[model samples]
Target: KETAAAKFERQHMDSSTSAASSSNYCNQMMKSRNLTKDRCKPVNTFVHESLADVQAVCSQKNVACKXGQTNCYQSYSTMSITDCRETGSSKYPNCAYKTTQANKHIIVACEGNPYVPVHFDASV
Candidate 1:
C-alpha cells in the first residue's frame, strides 16, 4: 500500500507538473503577443508552503512577492505576485501575471502532508 506521504507527494507532483505545463502555455501566449524580456512580468505564483517560505524564495530571487488573497495586477508595467497565501481557502486563489519588467515565470513550491501541489488556476 502507498504511504500517506507517498500519496501526497504523487498527487502534488502531478499537480505541479500540470501547472508547469500551463505556465509554459501562457508563456507561449505572451510570446505570440510580441512580449519580450523587460516587457513581461512574473505574477501569480501559487505555492503550497507557508507565506514565510514563499517570501524567502522571492527575496532570494530578488523579485517582489506579496501575501493576501487578491487578484493579480501589474504595476509600472512590472509583474507582481499578488494574493499569495499559505493557507488554502474555498476561493482557490492562485498567482497572477502581466506583461512587464519582471521575471517571465513564477516559481511555485508546494508543501503539505501530501507534499504535492494543492492546485492553482495557473496550472489550468
Candidate 2:
C-alpha cells in the first residue's frame, strides 16, 4: 500500500543518489523503483534535485502540464534529470528502457492540501 507521497518520492526524488551516468540508470531504476509493475511508464522523468527545490516549483515558475491538467508548475532552475522511456521493442515483464540525462527546467503536476508534486510532466 503505497501512499501518494511515497510514490512521489520513489518516482521523482533522487536527492542522495548520484545516478546520472548512463542509460542503464533508467532500466535499473525503473525496476528497482517499482515503476515497472503495471507497465513501463512511457516517459518518466526522475529529478535529482532536493525535495525542497522540487516542491518550490509551485511557487517558482509554471507551465502547462502535458496531460492537460491546470495544476502544473515549471521550475525556474534547470535541474539534473533522468528520463526513462520504453524502448521500441520493450514489452511487459521484460521491459526495456532508454535512459537520458539532461539539465532542464521541469514541469510537474501538483495537488492536495499543501500543494505538492504529484506527477512529473516533463523537462523543458
Candidate 3:
C-alpha cells in the first residue's frame, strides 16, 4: 500500500521541471503521474522544488487547512508550481487539463514520525 506521504509526493512533487513550457504539460503529467488512473483529478498542483525544501515546510508556520485541519503548514518562501485544472470538456479516461504556472506560498498537511507532507492543501 502506498503511504500518504508517498502518495502526496507522487501527486504533487516535481522538482525537475522549471515550468509548463507546453500547454499539454498538465494533460501529460496528470496521466503519467497516475492522477488519471480511474478518473480525472479535478484539480492538482505540482511543486517544482526539491523534496527537502517541501518537507521542511512541516516545521514552518502552522496554518489551518481548507477543512479546518490544524496539522497544515504554510511554506515560508514562495515556490515554483504548476496548477492543473480539468477542463469542462474533459471526460473520464480521456482527462484533459489546463496548466497554470506560478510562484506562491503553499500549504500542506504533515504526518508520521519524521513528519512530511501527506496532503497538498492549497497555494497562495
Candidate 4:
C-alpha cells in the first residue's frame, strides 16, 4: 500500500505545473495522476511549489494537528495553487473538472520518521 506521505506528493505537489493553463488541465491531470481511478475526488488541489517548500510547511504554521490522525501540519503562506473541482455535470468514470487558480493558505498532514508533509487536507 502507498504511504500517506507518498499520497500527498502524488496528489498535491506539482512542482512542474507551476501555473494554471486552460480548463483541460484539471480534467486531464486528475485522471493522469490516478486520482480518479476509484471515484471522482469532488475537490482536489495542486500546489505549484518546490518539494522542499511544501515539506517546510510542517515546521512553519505549527498549528494543532487534526485529531484521530498522526503527524499533521498546516501551512501559513498563501501559495499559488490550482484546484480541481468535479463539475456539476460530471459523472463517475467520465470524470470532468473545473480548474481554478488561487493563492491560499492550505492545511496538510505529515507522518513517518521520514517526516514529509503527507496529506493535502484542505484550504481556506
Candidate 5:
C-alpha cells in the first residue's frame, strides 16, 4: 500500500530539476510522476525545494487548511514552485497542462508522530 508521505512526494515534490526552459514541463512531469495515470489532475503544484525543507513546514506557523483543518502550517520563507493547471481542451489519457512558476510560501497539512506532510494545501 502506498503511504500518504509517498503519495505526497509523488504529487508535489520536484526538487532536482526546474521548468525554466521547458514550456512542456508539466506535460512530461505530470505523466511521468503518475498524476495523469487515469484522469487529469485539474490543478497541482510542484515545489522546487528539498523534501526536508517541505517537511519542516510541520513546525512552522499553524494555519487552517481549505477544509478548515488546523493541522496545516504555512512556510515562513517563499520557495520556488511550479503550478500545473489542466487546459480546457485536455482529455483523459492525453493529459495536458499549463505550467506557471512562482515563489511563494507553501501551506501543507501534516500528520503522524514523525511530523510529516500528508497534503499540499496552498501557496501564498
Candidate 6:
C-alpha cells in the first residue's frame, strides 16, 4: 500500500493533471503571506477547481474520484490575522485582507475521473 504522502506526491507529479499549477499557486500564496511550512500546516480537503495537484494525488492513491465530492483532501490550520483593507472604491469596493493563521491549510476538492483538486484557498 502506498503511504498517503507518497500517493500525494506521485499523483501530484503527473503531467496529465494540473497539479503543478496548484502546487505553484500554493507556494506563491504562502510566500506572499510570508508563511513558513513550520508555522502553517498543509491539508488536502475536498478537491475543487483549483487544487489540480492534490486531485492527482488522490487518484494515484486509488481513492474513488467522485464528482462534486470531498473525495480528495485539504490542509487546515488556525487563522492568524495579517491585514485587511478595501479595494476599488466607496461606490464599488472590495474586501481584501491577509492572514497569518496557523493550520490555515488549503482545500483540494476532487472533480471527475482521474480525480483532481479544483478549488483552493486563494486567501492570503
Best by lDDT: 3
Stretches of candidate 3 off by over 4 Å are none
Off by over 4 Å in 2: none
Residue-pair clashes per candidate, as listed?
9, 1, 0, 0, 0, 32
User: Model 6: per-residue lDDT, tens digit, 1-124?
Assistant: 6544444333322233322233244334443433333343232222122334334433432222243444545434322222222223312122222322222333344455445444433221
**Positional deviation of 122 in candidate 3, in angstroms?**
0.5
Candidate 3, residue 29: lDDT = 94
Task: Give lDDT for model 3.
Answer: 0.92
Error of 6 at 84 (Å): 8.5
Model 6, residue 87: distance off in Å is 11
Model 3 earns a TM-score of 0.95
* Candidate closer to the true structure by lDDT (higher is better), 1 or 6: 6
Q: Give the worst 10-residue stretch by lDDT in candidate 1.
A: 71-80
Candidate 6 lDDT (Cα, 0 to 1): 0.34
Model 3 residue 54 lDDT?
A: 95
Question: Rank by lDDT, descending?
Answer: 3, 5, 4, 2, 6, 1
Candidate 5 global CA lDDT score: 0.90
Tens digit per residue, CA lDDT, model 1, 4-99: 334323322222222333334344433333323333333334223333333233223322224323222212212222222122221212322331
Q: Cα-based RMSD of the predictions, in order?
A: 14.4, 1.7, 1.0, 1.9, 1.3, 13.3
Query: lDDT scores for all predictions?
Result: 0.30, 0.81, 0.92, 0.81, 0.90, 0.34
Q: How high is the lDDT of residue 110 in model 6?
A: 47
Candidate 5, residue 9: how far the Cα is off, in Å: 0.8
Candidate 2: clashing residue pairs, number: 1
| Per-residue accuracy of model 4 over 22-104 as CA lDDT, tens digit each | 77889988998898999988988999988888888887665555543545567777888999999989999999999999998
In the range 17-106, model 2's lDDT, one tens digit per residue, is: 655667578888888888889977777778888898888887766567778667788887788888788999999888899988788888
Q: Provide TM-scores for the models.
A: 0.19, 0.88, 0.95, 0.88, 0.94, 0.28
Q: Quote model 4's TM-score.
A: 0.88
